Scaffold this active site. Structure first.
Site, PDB file in Angstrom:
ATOM      1  N   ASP B  72      18.442  -0.476  37.966  1.00  0.00           N
ATOM      2  CA  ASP B  72      17.049  -0.878  38.019  1.00  0.00           C
ATOM      3  C   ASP B  72      16.832  -2.192  38.758  1.00  0.00           C
ATOM      4  O   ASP B  72      17.784  -2.833  39.233  1.00  0.00           O
ATOM      5  CB  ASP B  72      16.541  -1.013  36.576  1.00  0.00           C
ATOM      6  N   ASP B 141      16.542  -1.725  21.582  1.00  0.00           N
ATOM      7  CA  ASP B 141      15.744  -0.562  21.187  1.00  0.00           C
ATOM      8  C   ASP B 141      16.377   0.776  21.612  1.00  0.00           C
ATOM      9  O   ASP B 141      15.736   1.824  21.550  1.00  0.00           O
ATOM     10  CB  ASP B 141      14.320  -0.687  21.757  1.00  0.00           C
ATOM     11  N   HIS B 143      17.385   1.582  24.746  1.00  0.00           N
ATOM     12  CA  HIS B 143      17.138   2.002  26.123  1.00  0.00           C
ATOM     13  C   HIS B 143      18.366   1.928  27.024  1.00  0.00           C
ATOM     14  O   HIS B 143      19.216   1.051  26.866  1.00  0.00           O
ATOM     15  CB  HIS B 143      15.930   1.267  26.756  1.00  0.00           C
ATOM     16  N   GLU B 148      12.629   3.106  28.647  1.00  0.00           N
ATOM     17  CA  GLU B 148      12.114   2.666  27.353  1.00  0.00           C
ATOM     18  C   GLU B 148      11.782   3.801  26.404  1.00  0.00           C
ATOM     19  O   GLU B 148      11.655   4.950  26.815  1.00  0.00           O
ATOM     20  CB  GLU B 148      10.864   1.808  27.569  1.00  0.00           C
TER      21      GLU B 148
END
Ligand SMILES: CC(=O)N[C@@H]1[C@@H](O)[C@H](O)[C@@H](COP(=O)(O)O)O[C@@H]1O
Ligand SMILES: CC(=O)N[C@@H]1[C@@H](O)[C@H](O)[C@@H](COP(=O)(O)O)O[C@@H]1O
Ligand SMILES: CC(=O)N[C@@H]1[C@@H](O)[C@H](O)[C@@H](COP(=O)(O)O)O[C@@H]1O
Ligand SMILES: CC(=O)N[C@@H]1[C@@H](O)[C@H](O)[C@@H](COP(=O)(O)O)O[C@@H]1O
Ligand SMILES: CC(=O)N[C@@H]1[C@@H](O)[C@H](O)[C@@H](COP(=O)(O)O)O[C@@H]1O
Ligand SMILES: CC(=O)N[C@@H]1[C@@H](O)[C@H](O)[C@@H](COP(=O)(O)O)O[C@@H]1O
Lengths: 266, 266, 266, 266, 266, 266
Positions: B72, B141, B143, B148
């Site tokens: 990313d 979380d 990811h 996400e």
């Protein structure tokens, strides 16, 4: 998924055998187009093997044109050991039916090149095209074949290290000595099974109650590999009474209404 | 899935680097057949980058024939900003190794046509065939890359809006000012990662304990995208001690027995 | 997955219709390259059908070059029965738009050969290539189309036996007599839907709150077939206020920030 | 709650037995102030009774002023039956210690008025005032004493009907014939137990792993009555190695360091 | 349970402080009937002590007849150490209010007989009769006071051994050196707390989001001792915005409308 | 807990009504020692009040010495309003039985001081000493009386604000206009209920299936206050067929055999 809620292991075996015979007979296998059957070992398929031999003797089926593939095999266990999967399959099935020796496929747990063995095994299935019906059982921990908890849901045939619990469970066959149960096994992967046209899992006894719930009412996860059937377009689970105890009343009610006619052979 | 239970981030990086070097060396890349490596940024891969540079300097690996793809990049962050992913990768890895500039691939977060950028990125991976090994980390979380919670498990490279928590977490690098962390990022999708031949996730610190449990013991779901590895035929998670605290004793025991020899470099 | 958190069914229908019109118009369908739309029935799509007819009358869309496929149909219900899905679709949509009769596809629940009907239906979709956008609703129990709990996540068009609860729920349309609701239906499978390019599910009312949570925050499982969208690369759920009540505050906050501009037609 | 993580059943017995002796000796029982001890049957406390007998014979403890109360007794099984809890207690404990008959309190499962029996039993405890230490085991489904799933967490001594599963578990002592095991049993309730000044539960075997997790990591509920210990001010769980397999790494870590010095006694 | 949903820590402090003042003033404490207040330390109550100091200085409240009891204290840390709870309390509260030394009750973590200390403490509360209002915070793992996971829901004041996680959390006040934080602490038990006439818990930050969900939406269990408030007749949770992120939309909706008028005070 | 599995609401009413009569008659109420009965409103107890009226008319029971207390009452709704719980009780029960006005105790939802009302109510119960049997139903979200989710498990009689969901449920009796149903209600608390000597809850309909599962198989929590029955020493749940659909097969199996003889009365 279809779930056949029967009462006893005897009925389970009679249902499974009957379903296999119908698939084979409806298929009309030839030498140029054989029926490919995947098979399991363990205490679970005993009643099914018993009924299959019967039906064959009664002239209801002929395995003359059936090619078989077994799910797994113990690593480092001599082929002649009574408890080797090769022994199991001959003692309980092969010796009693008219299947050609060249039509039988089993993994060699004593293969010098483990990777080569597993690859060739997958290449052998491919040459036939696909497994028409893969019969199997389910482990207490939810394993399908020896794809133990944390096995990839896209795994192929490979070597796997047996969980301690699986070994303790299998010590039954080794005069209750866990120290005698092989620590490893060659096994077809989850993806290998998902590739079969139809998958039929036999569930017997209260010990499998949690595995059945994981399969039927649980989510897709790799801890309980039997959950992979939720992704299979044609799976059937044949169960007895004790194995359905962890299911919701509504779930069993649905399946009972569904298979009412289909299970009333009588 | 394989899980390497190590004790420290240092060991984690030494294990990962070693595994990458072995893949590359065993592969024997040429200019006509290069090794394609997927890479991450963040605090997690620091030890691995450190060990990789070492090994290269010691003449253990050559990236002369390795093509890289990063996961990313921040949208709207100037390329020269110290915290841009482009900066990170050059500062911590590229500047120190013998990789050709034409062999490096990074997403342009300042691309005027976001969709065009992402599509071309996917087209660039395809021209090479496939990513041989994709290394990554995991978010608090769950990811993977910036996919996400609520990201499609079949998603491709596209733009994504960062969760508030991810931004607060990343504010570390922006002198603790969430208001300075970019709200969007271009990221490879879950399906993009699932397409890699092998996926290696590094898990470090107690903050990732819940994400590791979701990955290892949880079910496949899109809230915790790291669960997608359960569907990958070749995933490895390299962990330290604090990140394994939420696992069941039996789960860790299994992995410990499994990697005993494989982790005893000493 | 995108989730459009609106307030009322009216807004939901206006958003959905608008999205369909935009897809069609941006697509520019011809007779040699038509837009394939999948459609549902039930109380849920009423507002969307209402707004679509409006827009058409206002000269905003033309279905002259749109081919439609419906999800399911009741087995053994006369085609002329007001409550048959064939009746529903004509009464509420077809009769009011400029779609060619040869462009409409519906399953024949009175087909003498159920299997033949379902296979041909799948063959008809294939001849067109793929469904560009499949619109649907979600059942209280999480079913998508009539893929009731325990339906394969890789299932095709086939006959399914309706759950008792679905029948009680649908008795609304049969003057509240469950005994009048058909026990079976021909329905497209989960795999059939997963094959669509884009899937848009409408969620309205508190009765669907649990189904929305299963879809958004739950894991992939076959008890709640709507969870299959987590595997779809392009799914959108358009919701009203009561249907979001079971979601976590953070989940809704994320989606609210995401669609702020996209939902402010005003 | 304290949880003593040991490796072996022998260790559990040695630990538990030393604990009882220490408490008794610290108490300094006399004819007017006896030490009241609650005791269980089953395979679990075998190593404990053994160790206790060893200590008494060695002159370390005397039961001359210890009043004992047993948790339960089968209804309808003759007193002299080898498997009646009355026989178990004498064969395994009373026959070897210096406890006067007066001090032994067992539930009479062959009483003419079962209601009166249970009530007088509770009266016996009250007369002495309080049970200082109640030792017990835990069933596979977490039942404590015979307070099967769905028993009130505020229950008193009463007649209870055993779960089919419990009967299957106990069939071992009845030549594995489930039909041999009594369907009913008189048992102390959860309330009776919570009234005890201190409760020590012995957990041995993999079969108890789920029960142990429920007790330590689960919520209070009446399906796993062992969870009632979360409301007790003085509860101790003494475990062997396989019983801790379902706990979290962090959970077992915590307890290990707390009890470190406390178990090094060997 | 009441849950006051506020946005900011400043608001939480202002709300909480006004609540205490209101209760005190309504009570009308005197020398014979003092108002007994339970208090916590940590970062959570900082805004509350501040507001309280503001109100006292403004002549709104007097602590001249308020007896206070603190939840806990580190063992072995010298009284005068800047981080001892004794120092925190004086530096942040006592130094600015008119509370006589007689009225201050803190646990002596450096007492020769820790057992005697805890017991006399409980005796102190009993002598006054009852704590009218106990204010406290909640740990990241839901621990209340130092009643760490697995503490009895019926526990009294005693010595406790801190979880490694708690120590890491508190290392902030010890220059982030976990090795600096005390391994033990004297603390009031869950029972001591449940005896309080009213309990007000302040929840601030995203780090407490899981603890808040456990408390409000979870079941009662000893792993998250904060869940004990479900058994309390008068409990209030005052929260800022990020702490409510794991609650359900419906849960927060309910509370928002209940407290609407109650928080508009600004 | 006892759970009476019946098929029909008529059976539930017949069973429940016989139970009340039996208890009363066994008690032998007189002017000095009346039998105290707690009663509910709603659609659930309709068959029970009917059966009870039948038995009284037949001369089987007399309420001449039975004191009754109702669970709750709407606040602000006029007494004579057809839907006030006062009207419901008289229209459906009191108007047909021989209960003197003196013996009827209902909460006054139009009292000048709501606080005083609730307190005097609790005082009324105490004056008699104890409610011998409290009959009630369960809400769709498991609320007992009007103790909505998040009510204290130790709550007493007080004013309560209804959940929007409850209002929607009750709108049926207010021409389906949610705006018609009262936002507040005076209600007995969970503590008041737990003080009852025996509690009998009637469960009817599919809408209560989740509540029944929570009560029987869930943990104790304040979101489903009906779970408080797990802490009650004498609780009975009388159910019809669709309300047991979410239970486990084993759960319903157990109860079926326990109550076999007990329900054969027909
Ligand atoms: C010698 C041995 O036991 N090898 C297996 C390997 O074959 C397997 O692939 C992996 C788990 O991965 P999987 O279950 O996802 O394939 O575990 C071990 O490394
Ligand atoms: C500007 C922006 O943020 N766009 C993204 C889109 O790229 C993504 O596809 C979708 C979630 O879907 P996905 O995570 O399933 O792809 O969310 C947003 O619409
Ligand atoms: C007559 C009838 O109802 N047939 C269906 C069959 O079409 C379906 O395949 C199966 C469930 O399997 P699936 O939901 O996984 O396809 O149930 C029933 O056998
Ligand atoms: C003969 C018999 O089995 N009687 C028991 C009764 O004693 C017990 O109270 C109840 C369950 O309640 P409890 O477990 O909550 O007391 O079930 C049964 O009726
Ligand atoms: C020195 C020390 O740490 N002592 C505590 C003890 O005070 C506590 O009672 C018990 C857990 O029980 P509780 O939390 O249930 O009281 O653990 C430890 O032994
Ligand atoms: C006017 C009104 O609605 N008052 C109630 C109060 O009576 C109740 O105590 C509390 C929740 O607490 P409880 O349900 O735990 O008592 O909420 C509300 O403030």
């Amino acid at each position: 998924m279809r779930l056949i809620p029967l009462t006893t292991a005897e009925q389970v075996g009679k249902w499974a055998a009957r379903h296999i015979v119908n698939r084979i007979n409806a298929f009309k296998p030839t030498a140029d187009r054989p029926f490919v059957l995947g098979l399991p070992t363990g205490g679970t398929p005993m009643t099914t093997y018993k009924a299959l031999v019967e039906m064959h003797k009664a002239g209801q089926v002929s395995f003359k044109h059936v090619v078989t593939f077994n799910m797994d095999e113990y690593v480092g266990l001599p082929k002649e050991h009574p408890e080797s999967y090769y022994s199991f399959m001959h003692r309980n099935f092969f010796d009693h039916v008219d299947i050609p020796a060249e039509n039988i496929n089993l993994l060699n747990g004593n293969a010098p090149d483990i990777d080569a063995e597993c690859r060739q095994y997958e290449e052998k299935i491919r040459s036939y095209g696909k497994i028409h019906l893969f019969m199997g059982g389910v482990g207490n921990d939810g394993h399908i074949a020896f794809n133990e908890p944390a096995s990839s849901l896209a795994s192929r045939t490979r070597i796997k290290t047996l969980t301690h619990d699986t070994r303790v469970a299998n010590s039954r066959f080794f005069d209750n000595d866990v120290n005698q149960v092989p620590k490893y096994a060659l096994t077809v992967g989850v993806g290998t099974l998902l590739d079969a046209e139809e998958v039929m899992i036999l569930v017997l006894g209260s010990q499998k109650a949690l595995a059945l719930q994981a399969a039927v009412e649980g989510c897709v996860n790799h801890m309980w590999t039997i959950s992979c059937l939720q992704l299979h377009p044609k799976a059937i689970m044949v169960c007895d009474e004790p194995s359905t105890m962890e299911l919701k009343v509504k779930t069993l009610r649905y399946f009972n209404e569904l298979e009412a006619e289909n299970i009333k052979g009588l």
